[PDB]
């Protein structure tokens, strides 16, 4: 009931980010939503004395048809004062469920002097009327201070469930609660239904699990007949992997390509060449040497489009030091829409990153800036938004992860 | 009759900055006499109030004769206070576009300019608006004044005023959804499709509603001249536009970009000045000679957008709901870059038109595009980037966008294999480019004024020139791969354009990459030849 004093970081003004265009349906949904939040006192209209702004738009979460208000607090979160633990068990758990606990934030007042920086604008079509300007009175969904400030209340609500179930790992990131287990889904959902019940006894009606390899092994072909082209591709892949792995050698394989030969011609492997290829296999079976996570440095996520709905990704902090690699093969929403697939890949990769390290990575997207910025909000279903940059030059490496 | 007050808008100065302390300029006795007369009337009207000696702030006041009508006009120069006043959320950054307006049967104008001086200024801020009328012969203390209302020329006045008018009109617009109200200058524009009797009645209700806040309305005519447009009841168009060895002064005209929104086929690619410059090699569009008007928006009909390729990285589009009646038109210029193709540019035009249409009509239009469905499918399924264009249909209006070549995914059986390499000396700018093949074909060409990158491209060109219709090419040039894998159809480098022209003639091309200096036999032999 007593607000926590919050201030921006030293030497930084409040956010002043342009509101981007919205469709009529999203504007109509945002009006209905904000009209009701106004009556509930969560937000209040503001005047021209407020120069600050944060973009707003609308989404439909997974398996629901109801519009939800999403605010892009990325700029405010950067400039918000760092407010002063990550469970390594969450990644190791067999099954983790994700719960939207954001509505809980709306029962906590926001510091009076800080409300000015939560200002948002509902745009008008064709600029025909002025924008509807609001600011928050309660803790906003998507703000980094909202979990921080609410943490004191959250532990109190969850200590009963935690004592009753100690094997359950519980983790909170933004509006999301991550609840891990090693039990069966039916009882998992039963314990999950139990957690919601505690939440109803002050909330909304995602099932995920870890996969086998953290870093997917590099694999080489096993053939009985090698063409010149097969051996050229292999030498290329091994030269690339030699930037990651120490003792990769290609001399005995490159020697087979001696002469000016037709690409489709079969070349039998020499005994020296078979041994070299086997030693490289052995090298690639071991882990990468000296790969550490540093919480100070940013995480970097790279995505390649491999075609036919397949996508590859690598998370790292230093080049050739992969903390995780993976491959996403099917996106149900879009066999005809590359951008929907990419957007769902970014969301899956961010979720995994939240589980493993408890922070989102910076993405390098295989897309032109203008195409991505036009369409990603149409397919976004998460309450957080990561950072991203754009790759304009085709990487030669796409082959090596294929 | 009690009048509801206009709630003041709390204003503050920027943090750490204090108010203005500028020097009042010496005035002529005639000007001082003119200012004293004005301010006494303004004071009698409540717009300003005389202040005592306590206020330490001052803003200079000037007098300008208005068209020598034997009358003077007061001018207070708030430039300094504006620099020290807080920032505001201005709301006029985007103007409505006429093509987004809906047709209306009746549209009435009302004068609400009297409301500007009816909007109060924050009490605690008035002391910062102080100004001094100098005394005759400087023998008395000048008359001191401060503002009680939003001053003309102050930073906050435009934003505070509109936000005040909107707060006033909200009950009326909510309770009368059968009407629309737009605010331009000192006049309000109210439109409706009701019978002329009901429309005039509701205007009387608006005048009554404004009278509650004391705003009093007096007792134009279509077409309306607004923001460089002409707004007729059934059509809209731009206001007239106007254009020698003096063209050297500027390319600010040129302003055909403003015309481009309704006049089709306008081009501005002359790109001169890419303060005195030569001009040559240009075409007068001269399509501005004949009048062209746009239509208003009917939300019950579909929105359509058709794009045409005009050449030289230029694209033109029309947005319409019914055939041959255009809501608006426009153009798109290719982005500055070294290599490009038509499919990427058409994709960027689609995205530009999409966002503009969201702005103006709140929805994406259906597209008609000069590209075959099969062409687009081949493109996006094989393009290394993710791409997408919204719902669209093919229109057979040449020039048609097409794919000009497609590289093979696998080596070609029975096609000759060309191993190419190129190298140059950084100091002499001399180099070699060449190939060796599986059939024993060879070439090495000596080159002057070249780089390692140009020799790598030239070697690929040689293999393409001297090969049959089907050919396998092995290079170690990551630079050449990055270029060809981006599928350019045109380039700024004439060497890339020549490779493109050779690729268009081939039936099958497989381009394979190998690492350099690793002993790949064909690459090793040609590398020794070209690095000599
Ligand atoms: C006579 C023309 C006509 O009727 N056009 C139909 C569109 C239309 C509808 C409703 C109104 Cl209120 C309107 O008036 C405006 C709008 C705007 Cl942006 C600016 C101005 C001004 N200066 C007036 C226009």
């Amino acid at each position: 009931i007593e607000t926590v004093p919050v201030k921006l970081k030293p030497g930084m003004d409040g956010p002043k980010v342009k509101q981007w265009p919205l469709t009529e349906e999203k504007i109509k949904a945002l009006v209905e939503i904000c009209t009701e939040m106004e009556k509930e006192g969560k937000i209040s209209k503001i005047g021209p004395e407020n120069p600050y702004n944060t973009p707003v738009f609308a989404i439909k979460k997974k398996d629901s048809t109801k519009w939800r208000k999403l605010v892009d607090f990325r700029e405010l979160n950067k400039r918000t004062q760092d407010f002063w633990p990550h469970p390594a068990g969450l990644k190791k758990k067999k099954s983790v469920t994700v719960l939207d606990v954001g509505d809980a934030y709306f029962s906590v007042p926001l510091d009076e002097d800080f409300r000015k920086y939560t200002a948002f604008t509902i745009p008008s079509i064709n600029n025909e009327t002025p924008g509807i300007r609001y600011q928050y009175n309660v803790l906003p969904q998507g703000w980094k201070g909202s979990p921080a400030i609410f943490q004191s209340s959250m532990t109190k609500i969850l200590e009963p469930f935690k004592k009753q179930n100690p094997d359950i790992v519980i983790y909170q990131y933004m509006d999301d609660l991550y609840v891990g287990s090693d039990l069966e889904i039916g009882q998992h959902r039963t314990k999950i239904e139990e957690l919601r019940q505690h939440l109803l006894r002050w909330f909304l009606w995602y099932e995920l699990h870890p996969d086998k390899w953290t870093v997917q092994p590099i694999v080489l072909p096993e053939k009985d007949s090698w063409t010149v082209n097969d051996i050229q591709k292999l030498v290329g892949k091994l030269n690339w992997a030699s930037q990651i792995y120490p003792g990769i050698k290609v001399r005995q394989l490159s020697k087979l390509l001696r002469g000016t030969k037709a690409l489709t011609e079969v070349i039998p492997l020499t005994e020296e060449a078979e041994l070299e290829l086997a030693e490289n296999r052995e090298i690639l079976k071991e882990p990468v040497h000296g790969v550490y996570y540093d919480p100070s440095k940013d995480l970097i996520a790279e995505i390649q489009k491999q075609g036919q709905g397949q996508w590859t990704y690598q998370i790292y902090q230093e080049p050739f030091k992969n903390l995780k690699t993976g491959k996403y093969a099917r996106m149900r929403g879009a066999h005809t829409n590359d951008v929907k697939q990419l957007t769902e890949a970014v969301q899956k990769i961010t979720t995994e990153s939240i589980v493993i390290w408890g922070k989102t990575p910076k993405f390098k997207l295989p897309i032109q800036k203008e195409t991505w910025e036009t369409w990603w909000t149409e397919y976004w279903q998460a309450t957080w938004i990561p950072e991203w940059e754009f790759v304009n030059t085709p990487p030669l490496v796409k082959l090596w992860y294929q | 009759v009690p009048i509801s007050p206009i709630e003041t808008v709390p204003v503050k100065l920027k943090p750490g900055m204090d108010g203005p302390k500028v020097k009042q300029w010496p005035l002529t006795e005639e000007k001082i006499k003119a200012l004293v007369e004005i301010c006494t009337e303004m004071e009698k009207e409540g717009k300003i109030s005389k202040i005592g000696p306590e206020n330490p702030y001052n803003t200079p006041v000037f007098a300008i004769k208005k068209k020598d009508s034997t009358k003077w006009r007061k001018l207070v120069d708030f430039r300094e206070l504006n620099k020290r006043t807080q920032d505001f959320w201005e709301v006029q950054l985007g103007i409505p576009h006429p093509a987004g307006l809906k047709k209306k049967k009746s549209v009435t104008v009302l004068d609400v300019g009297d409301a500007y001086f009816s909007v109060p200024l924050d009490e605690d801020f008035r002391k910062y608006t102080a100004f001094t009328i100098p005394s005759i012969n400087n023998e008395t203390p000048g008359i001191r004044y401060q503002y009680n209302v939003l001053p003309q020329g102050w930073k906050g006045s435009p934003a505070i005023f509109q936000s005040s008018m909107t707060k006033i009109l909200e009950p009326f617009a909510a309770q009368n959804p059968d009407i629309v109200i737009y605010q331009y200058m000192d006049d309000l524009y109210v439109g409706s499709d009701l019978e002329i009797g009901q429309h005039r009645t509701k205007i009387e209700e608006l005048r009554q509603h404004l009278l509650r806040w004391g705003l009093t309305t007096p007792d134009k005519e279509p077409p309306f001249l607004w923001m460089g447009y002409e707004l007729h009841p059934d059509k809209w168009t731009v206001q007239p536009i106007v254009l020698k060895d003096s063209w050297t002064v500027n390319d600010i005209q040129g302003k055909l970009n403003w015309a481009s929104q309704i006049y089709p086929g306008i081009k501005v690619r002359q790109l001169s000045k890419l303060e005195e410059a030569e001009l040559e090699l240009a075409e007068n569009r001269e399509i501005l000679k004949e009048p062209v008007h746009g239509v208003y928006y009917d939300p019950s009909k579909d929105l359509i957008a058709e794009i045409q390729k005009q050449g030289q990285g230029q694209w033109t589009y029309q947005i319409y709901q019914e055939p041959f009646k255009n809501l608006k038109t426009g153009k798109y210029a290719r982005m500055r870059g070294a290599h490009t193709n038509d499919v990427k540019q058409l994709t960027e035009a689609v995205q530009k038109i999409t966002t503009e249409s969201i702005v103006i009509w709140g929805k994406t239009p259906k597209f008609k595009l000069p590209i075959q469905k099969e062409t687009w499918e081949t493109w996006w399924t094989e393009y290394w980037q993710a791409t997408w264009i919204p719902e669209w249909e093919f229109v057979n209006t040449p020039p048609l966008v097409k794919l000009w070549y497609q590289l093979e995914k696998e080596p070609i059986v029975g096609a000759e294999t060309f191993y190419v390499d190129g190298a140059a000396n950084r100091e002499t700018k001399l180099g070699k480019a060449g190939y060796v093949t599986n059939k024993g074909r060879q070439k090495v060409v000596p080159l002057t004024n070249t780089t390692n990158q140009k020799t790598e491209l030239q070697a690929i060109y040689l293999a393409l020139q001297d090969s049959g219709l089907e050919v396998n090419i092995v290079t170690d040039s990551q630079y050449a791969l990055g270029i060809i894998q981006a599928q350019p159809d045109k380039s700024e480098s004439e060497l890339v354009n020549q490779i493109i022209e050779q690729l268009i003639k081939k039936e099958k091309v497989y381009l394979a990459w190998v690492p350099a200096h690793k002993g790949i036999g064909g690459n090793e032999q040609v590398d020794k030849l070209v690095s000599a």
Side-chain angles (χ1 to χ4, degrees), chain A residues 1-6 8 10-60 64-65 67-80 82 84-93 95-152 154-157 159-162 164-182 186 188-189 191 195 198 201 206-257 259-285 287-288 290-291 293-329 333-402, chain B residues 1-2 4-6 8-11 13-20 22 24 26-64 69 72 74-82 84-89 94-116 118-177 179-194 197-199 201-203 205-207 209-210 212-219 222-240 246 254 257-266 268 277 281-282 284 290-294 296-335 337-428 430-523 525-532:
Chain A
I1 184 185
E2 182 175 358
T3 77
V4 170
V6 177
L8 300 166
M12 293 185 178
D13 201 14
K16 289 173 163 189
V17 187
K18 283 187 176 180
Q19 173 65 54
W20 57 68
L22 305 181
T23 50
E24 178 178 71
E25 74 182 343
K26 294 179 171 55
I27 292 176
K28 173 173 173 298
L30 285 168
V31 175
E32 305 187 66
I33 292 173
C34 290
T35 294
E36 293 298 305
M37 297 177 69
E38 193 178 13
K39 300 179 198 163
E40 299 175 357
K42 304 172 169 170
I43 59 182
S44 300
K45 303 256 189 67
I46 60 169
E49 69 270 25
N50 193 328
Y52 306 114
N53 192 60
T54 291
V56 71
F57 68 110
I59 66 168
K60 284 166 171 250
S64 177
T65 77
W67 289 109
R68 185 197 197 276
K69 169 152 93 68
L70 181 42
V71 186
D72 180 5
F73 279 123
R74 277 179 291 173
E75 195 59 28
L76 179 62
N77 286 344
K78 296 157 177 153
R79 306 151 175 257
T80 286
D82 283 352
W84 312 106
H86 187 65
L90 192 58
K91 59 170 163 275
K92 303 157 180 285
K93 285 283 111 69
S95 303
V96 175
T97 296
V98 191
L99 281 170
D100 190 357
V101 300
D103 186 82
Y105 293 146
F106 287 164
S107 73
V108 176
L110 183 63
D111 184 59
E112 184 52 45
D113 293 316
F114 198 79
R115 303 182 176 174
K116 68 171 84 82
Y117 306 120
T118 68
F120 65 89
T121 312
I122 302 184
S124 72
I125 301 181
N126 205 35
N127 309 138
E128 281 182 5
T129 61
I132 307 188
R133 297 267 296 161
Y134 289 97
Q135 85 181 7
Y136 266 97
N137 299 325
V138 304
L139 297 185
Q141 288 178 159
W143 182 48
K144 108 181 169 190
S146 287
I149 291 168
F150 193 80
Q151 197 177 16
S152 59
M154 182 68 75
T155 320
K156 170 169 165 190
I157 294 176
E159 278 299 343
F161 200 104
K162 289 162 156 232
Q164 155 90 19
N165 303 278
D167 288 340
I168 299 311
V169 182
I170 292 186
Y171 178 68
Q172 188 183 22
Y173 183 84
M174 297 306 314
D175 316 333
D176 294 323
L177 211 58
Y178 291 76
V179 193
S181 76
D182 273 316
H188 189 65
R189 298 157 192 200
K191 302 305 300 197
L195 201 27
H198 273 216
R201 189 184 319 104
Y206 207 6
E207 296 166 346
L208 67 89
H209 330 264
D211 52 47
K212 181 157 59 254
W213 300 96
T214 319
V215 176
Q216 311 314 316
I218 312 174
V219 308
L220 311 174
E222 300 180 10
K223 309 187 180 300
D224 300 322
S225 74
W226 295 76
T227 70
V228 174
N229 191 250
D230 292 324
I231 300 187
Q232 293 186 356
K233 294 156 61 177
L234 173 67
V235 169
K237 192 168 177 176
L238 288 174
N239 185 66
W240 161 83
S242 75
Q243 308 175 94
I244 300 160
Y245 286 88
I248 303 286
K249 300 288 137 98
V250 299
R251 184 167 177 271
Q252 298 305 315
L253 289 156
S254 302
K255 124 174 196 153
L256 310 160
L257 298 171
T260 312
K261 287 190 177 133
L263 272 194
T264 59
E265 176 177 326
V266 173
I267 299 310
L269 290 191
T270 59
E271 191 186 2
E272 305 89 321
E274 314 173 44
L275 181 65
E276 186 186 59
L277 173 57
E279 296 168 354
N280 294 321
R281 287 186 202 276
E282 280 288 296
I283 287 184
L284 295 167
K285 292 183 59 181
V288 189
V291 181
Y293 170 78
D294 180 0
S296 84
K297 309 183 290 183
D298 300 325
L299 290 159
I300 301 174
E302 282 190 16
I303 301 181
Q304 302 78 34
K305 165 181 176 182
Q306 302 286 353
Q308 309 171 20
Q310 312 206 75
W311 307 74
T312 50
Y313 68 93
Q314 306 80 36
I315 303 172
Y316 63 85
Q317 297 187 299
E318 314 261 337
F320 312 112
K321 299 292 179 179
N322 281 339
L323 313 187
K324 203 209 179 310
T325 79
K327 179 170 145 142
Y328 285 164
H335 312 65
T336 200
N337 195 330
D338 275 330
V339 181
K340 182 172 200 172
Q341 301 180 36
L342 180 56
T343 309
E344 295 172 359
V346 168
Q347 280 168 108
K348 297 175 88 174
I349 291 164
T350 301
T351 296
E352 293 174 16
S353 187
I354 293 169
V355 173
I356 300 171
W357 305 278
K359 72 182 186 179
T360 69
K362 175 152 204 187
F363 289 83
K364 296 177 66 186
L365 297 180
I367 192 170
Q368 288 302 124
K369 171 171 183 178
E370 295 72 22
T371 306
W372 169 263
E373 295 296 344
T374 295
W375 295 109
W376 71 264
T377 67
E378 290 292 305
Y379 320 110
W380 197 262
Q381 304 191 291
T383 63
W384 32 253
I385 308 165
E387 309 289 337
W388 45 60
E389 49 191 317
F390 303 102
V391 175
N392 310 121
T393 301
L396 197 57
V397 152
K398 143 169 145 196
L399 310 181
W400 314 142
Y401 289 113
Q402 174 192 33
Chain B
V1 209
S4 355
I6 307 188
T8 86
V9 172
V11 178
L13 294 171
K14 295 192 191 178
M17 299 200 212
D18 199 4
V22 191
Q24 175 56 60
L27 289 190
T28 90
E29 185 176 341
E30 171 186 1
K31 287 182 185 173
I32 294 168
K33 280 178 182 168
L35 288 179
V36 172
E37 193 162 9
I38 293 181
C39 293
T40 301
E41 316 305 337
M42 295 181 56
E43 188 205 351
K44 286 175 181 177
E45 295 178 343
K47 302 167 180 170
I48 51 177
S49 278
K50 297 177 150 241
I51 67 178
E54 293 83 28
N55 202 310
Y57 308 100
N58 188 78
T59 306
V61 63
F62 303 83
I64 64 103
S69 87
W72 291 85
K74 176 188 107 316
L75 182 150
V76 181
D77 172 30
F78 282 111
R79 283 183 305 170
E80 191 66 18
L81 174 65
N82 295 351
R84 298 140 180 270
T85 304
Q86 61 153 101
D87 280 284
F88 287 98
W89 180 259
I95 61 107
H97 185 269
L101 305 169
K102 273 68 55 200
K103 211 161 50 185
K104 293 300 170 176
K105 296 193 186 118
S106 306
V107 174
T108 296
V109 65
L110 311 169
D111 192 353
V112 296
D114 165 61
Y116 212 110
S118 188
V119 169
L121 180 62
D122 185 19
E123 163 69 24
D124 299 278
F125 197 86
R126 305 186 189 193
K127 64 179 184 176
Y128 300 140
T129 65
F131 60 105
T132 308
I133 314 175
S135 61
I136 296 173
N137 299 327
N138 325 313
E139 287 173 355
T140 41
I143 310 164
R144 287 288 276 181
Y145 277 102
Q146 82 182 356
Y147 269 89
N148 303 318
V149 302
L150 307 180
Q152 306 293 330
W154 178 57
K155 183 177 184 181
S157 294
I160 298 193
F161 178 79
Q162 183 164 105
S163 71
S164 303
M165 274 296 296
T166 296
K167 237 160 106 69
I168 283 169
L169 306 172
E170 256 189 34
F172 198 92
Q175 303 185 24
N176 303 274
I179 63 98
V180 295
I181 304 160
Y182 299 100
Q183 6 201 330
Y184 177 47
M185 281 309 121
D186 287 355
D187 356 319
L188 272 170
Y189 295 83
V190 194
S192 75
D193 292 337
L194 311 175
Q198 317 177 271
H199 165 90
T201 275
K202 288 213 183 189
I203 294 280
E205 309 190 348
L206 176 53
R207 293 176 96 261
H209 193 232
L210 292 152
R212 273 103 162 109
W213 288 270
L215 312 187
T216 194
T217 301
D219 308 353
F224 302 132
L225 306 195
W226 174 84
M227 297 309 299
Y229 298 106
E230 289 187 358
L231 308 173
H232 303 73
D234 61 335
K235 91 190 114 298
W236 76 268
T237 207
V238 283
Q239 278 169 34
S246 324
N257 282 11
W258 175 246
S260 78
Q261 66 189 314
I262 187 50
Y263 291 108
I266 271 166
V268 73
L281 218 61
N284 55 90
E290 155 256 21
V292 188
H293 67 87
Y296 295 119
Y297 176 60
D298 180 2
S300 63
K301 298 169 172 172
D302 263 326
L303 238 206
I304 315 296
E306 193 170 329
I307 304 179
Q308 297 84 30
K309 185 193 173 191
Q310 281 205 321
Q312 303 85 54
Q314 295 167 124
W315 302 76
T316 190
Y317 65 92
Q318 305 85 34
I319 299 166
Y320 65 84
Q321 301 181 282
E322 293 233 304
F324 305 109
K325 288 156 146 199
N326 285 343
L327 285 72
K328 88 182 294 290
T329 65
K331 56 192 173 59
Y332 175 74
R334 110 182 116 203
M335 287 188 306
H339 319 297
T340 192
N341 78 29
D342 284 338
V343 180
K344 298 191 199 186
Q345 298 174 10
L346 176 57
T347 299
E348 296 159 359
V350 167
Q351 308 304 349
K352 167 207 236 272
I353 296 160
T354 293
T355 300
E356 158 167 279
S357 306
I358 303 299
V359 168
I360 297 178
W361 303 283
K363 75 184 198 216
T364 306
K366 291 176 183 173
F367 284 92
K368 300 170 69 179
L369 301 181
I371 187 174
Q372 300 265 20
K373 283 277 167 172
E374 190 165 16
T375 296
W376 170 253
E377 160 116 317
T378 297
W379 168 256
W380 75 262
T381 49
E382 305 287 344
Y383 192 42
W384 73 275
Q385 280 188 334
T387 190
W388 159 263
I389 55 184
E391 178 175 339
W392 68 279
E393 291 181 328
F394 172 55
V395 45
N396 194 345
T397 50
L400 292 186
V401 174
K402 58 182 275 183
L403 289 181
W404 289 95
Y405 56 89
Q406 293 169 44
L407 311 185
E408 293 296 295
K409 302 177 175 64
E410 301 295 342
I412 310 159
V413 174
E416 192 175 353
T417 298
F418 282 68
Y419 297 77
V420 305
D421 197 13
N425 181 272
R426 225 193 143 75
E427 311 86 277
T428 73
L430 297 169
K432 305 173 162 195
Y435 60 73
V436 301
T437 91
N438 62 294
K439 286 154 64 180
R441 196 191 313 272
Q442 292 191 15
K443 177 177 288 193
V444 184
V445 167
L447 302 162
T448 66
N449 194 42
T450 197
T451 60
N452 278 318
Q453 280 181 356
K454 291 220 226 198
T455 59
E456 291 164 345
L457 286 170
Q458 174 85 22
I460 287 165
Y461 182 59
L462 292 160
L464 284 168
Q465 284 177 287
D466 304 352
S467 53
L469 292 164
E470 299 196 344
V471 62
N472 301 308
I473 298 171
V474 178
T475 171
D476 62 44
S477 177
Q478 309 174 33
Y479 168 75
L481 256 292
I483 294 189
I484 300 189
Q485 283 180 331
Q487 316 195 56
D489 76 354
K490 254 135 283 155
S491 183
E492 260 151 34
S493 172
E494 198 216 343
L495 185 43
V496 180
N497 284 324
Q498 287 176 312
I499 293 168
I500 296 169
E501 200 214 3
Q502 288 295 314
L503 290 169
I504 292 172
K505 301 175 201 289
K506 296 296 181 185
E507 287 178 351
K508 293 178 185 175
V509 175
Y510 181 65
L511 190 57
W513 175 88
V514 293
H517 300 323
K518 285 300 173 175
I520 290 87
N523 197 77
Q525 268 91 103
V526 68
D527 177 74
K528 187 150 236 308
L529 301 174
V530 302
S531 304

